Amino acid sequence: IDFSKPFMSLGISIMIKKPQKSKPGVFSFLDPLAYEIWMCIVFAYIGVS
Amino acid sequence: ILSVILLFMGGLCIAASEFYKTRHNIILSAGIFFVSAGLSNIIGIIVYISANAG
Ligand SMILES: CCCCCCCCCCCCCCCC(=O)O
Structure with a gap:
């Protein structure tokens, strides 16, 4: 058959799952340390006092 | 267990x-x-948490 001129140029692309904006949590300033450290600091604080 | 013994001695x-x-x-x-x-x-809390991290 004899095609006509392309009316839509395309190709092979890459599709991935759209990511999320990862809205920071309210209490995210605690993230640098683990929950165990934060809990142990309170225990250490009480003990020292 | 030392805490348990130390708490009993205190009582x-x-x-x-x-x-x-x-x-x-x-x-x-x-x-x-x-x-x-x-x-x-x-110490027990720190030893327990530091031994379950493996
Ligand atoms: C002076 C010693 C204590 C200073 C105040 C530190 C405040 C942090 C304690 C509360 C955080 C407990 C962690 C639970 C939340 C989490 O990180 O998942």
């Missing part, structure tokens, strides 16, 4: 205090037994 001192109301270093021993039991508990 024994409070009972003994009731009898020997003239020996004031028994109440002091109880206070040190209760403060050292809490410090033992702290």
Whole structure:
């Protein structure tokens, strides 16, 4: 058959799952340390006092 | 388990205090037994959390 001129140029692309904006949590300033450290600091604080 | 033993020894001192109301270093021993039991508990918490991290 004899095609006509392309009316839509395309190709092979890459599709991935759209990511999320990862809205920071309210209490995210605690993230640098683990929950165990934060809990142990309170225990250490009480003990020292 | 040391905390459990240190807490038991502290409680024994409070009972003994009731009898020997003239020996004031028994109440002091109880206070040190209760403060050292809490410090033992702290170490146990840190040892438990640091041994389950593997
Ligand atoms: C002076 C010693 C204490 C200072 C104040 C530190 C405040 C942090 C304690 C609360 C945080 C507990 C952690 C639970 C939340 C989490 O990180 O998942």
